[PDB]
Design a protein around this nucleic acid. Structure first.
Ligand SMILES: Nc1nc2c(ncn2[C@H]2C[C@H](O)[C@@H](COP(=O)(O)NP(=O)(O)OP(=O)(O)O)O2)c(=O)[nH]1
Ligand SMILES: [Mg+2]
Ligand SMILES: [Mg+2]
Length: 425
DNA sequence: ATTCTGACGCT
């Protein structure tokens, strides 16, 4: 009753760019705009692996993790843009720099947690208060929410339903109560519209947004109405929302843990978790997960918006599947050098931009036939931004995996250098 | 033979 907290204290938004790499390519090459198009890596093996698909191409069934040669079978007019290759590997620089454009705009409005290359979380709690005070009891007009969906509304053409649902919501709002959580989400949603307009005016990129009370619901909400739309998931929309929402759709339940929840408990949808006591959930899934499941299926999550705009690591990786696996000493050195040279270029730029230095170098490898994704992971000290030292140090730290009696055995199916443990500079 | 990352938990 009066003492059960409900997790309505914060306003949090999740903003995610629509088909991000495709839009980066469509801004640069106007011929790709408004066409079925995808972004690939490499081109020789089945036309390249697709990692970004425009919404026009998706109408034909083109998805991520698909080979371009297969996508062409579904979509014969599909236009492909290729990630830049450097030193024999894919080079994601253009998208990381495009991401920085976006993150810097978002950060003018509020503190953001960079959650991926194309998405950040936003804590709007303070911005909403400041804004609620400025409005001075003034009602909120649908004109301020031109692209907002209210989840679960209307109740009782797509743009027609959106406006109906928005009118119903706005009509019910108690505008004189500066502490009502629904009012705060609505105001949060006004700011997100502003944030999304500034991103498009200043980058040309379009995006979607989720507006709710915590990071997990904002993320879920963000996908309900992509593309170029934002969605407000209110505390009261949760029971209906979760009653048919598959467990796997919730961030962090998409894998094994969500599968064990499904299998142990004999359930399918998020809302079914509410029938289990916290202790029961803790008993099956641990004290942390259990507490987090007991609260999450009621729409409650306390994970904070971390004030972190920059990555914590900087990493370079290349897979070597199949017969291309590295089998010689010279080969493993040349690719450590290729990896280290990109890492160095990235690091020197990070130091100059962000006033910091990485202090630890992590080397990860895979050998052929090793079931695991990493056959080994070892760290050494990262004392100089010198590619030749880093690659040499990576070799020193993995050379005892070779079993050869100049040859390399087992052949390596993955090299991976990561710079970590940043310190101010 | 999607590949290339990046966060964060567990022990
Ligand atoms: N190298 C690599 N890049 C990837 C991979 N997956 C995605 N990317 C790249 C390409 C993606 O643009 C971006 C991740 O953004 P998302 O939210 O996952 N997808 P998007 O923005 O395309 O579509 P929408 O958000 O509208 O659903 O990173 C991958 O496995 N590998
Ligand atoms: Mg995206
Ligand atoms: Mg994303």
């Amino acid at each position: 009753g009066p003492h059960m907290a409900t997790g309505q204290d914060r306003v949090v938004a999740l903003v995610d760019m629509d088909c991000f790499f495709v839009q980066v390519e469509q801004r640069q090459n106007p011929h790709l705009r408004n066409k079925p198009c995808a972004v690939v890596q490499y081109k020789s093996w089945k036309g390249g692996g697709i990692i970004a698909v425009s919404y026009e191409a998706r109408a034909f069934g083109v998805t991520r993790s698909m080979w371009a040669d297969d996508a062409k079978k579904l979509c014969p007019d599909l236009l492909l843009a290729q990630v830049r290759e450097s030193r024999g590997k894919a080079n994601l620089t253009k998208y990381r720099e495009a991401s920085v454009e976006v993150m810097e705009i978002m950060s003018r409005f509020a503190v953001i947690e960079r959650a991926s290359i194309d998405e950040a979380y936003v804590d709007l709690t303070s911005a909403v208060q400041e804004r609620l005070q400025k409005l001075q009891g003034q009602p909120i007009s649908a004109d301020l929410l031109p692209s907002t969906y209210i989840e679960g509304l209307p109740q009782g053409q797509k743009e027609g339903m959106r406006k109906q649902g928005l009118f119903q919501w706005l009509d019910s709002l108690q505008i004189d109560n500066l502490t009502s959580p629904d009012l705060q989400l609505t105001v949060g949603a006004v700011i997100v519209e502003e944030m999304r307009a500034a991103i498009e005016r200043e980058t040309g990129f379009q995006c979607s947004a989720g507006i709710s009370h915590n990071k997990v619901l904002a993320k879920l909400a963000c996908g309900l109405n992509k593309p170029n739309r934002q969605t407000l998931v209110s505390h009261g929309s949760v029971p209906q929302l979760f009653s048919q929402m598959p467990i796997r759709k919730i961030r962090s339940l998409g894998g094994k843990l969500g599968a064990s929840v499904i299998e142990i408990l004999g359930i399918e949808y998020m809302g079914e978790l509410t029938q289990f006591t916290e202790s029961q959930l803790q008993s099956h899934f641990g004290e942390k997960n259990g507490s987090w499941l007991y609260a999450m299926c009621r729409g409650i999550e306390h994970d904070p918006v971390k004030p972190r705009q920059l990555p914590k690591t900087i990493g370079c990786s290349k897979n070597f599947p199949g017969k291309t696996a590295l089998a010689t000493r010279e080969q493993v050195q040349w690719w450590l050098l290729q990896l280290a040279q990109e890492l160095e270029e990235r690091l020197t730029k990070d130091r100059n931009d962000n006033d910091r230095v990485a202090t630890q170098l992590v080397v990860s490898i895979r050998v052929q036939g090793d079931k695991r994704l990493s056959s080994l992971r070892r760290c050494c000290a990262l004392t100089r931004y010198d590619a030749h030292k880093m690659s040499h140090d990576a070799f020193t730290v993995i050379k005892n995996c070779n079993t050869s009696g100049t040859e390399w055995s087992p052949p390596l199916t993955m090299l991976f250098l990561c710079a970590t443990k940043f310190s101010a500079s």
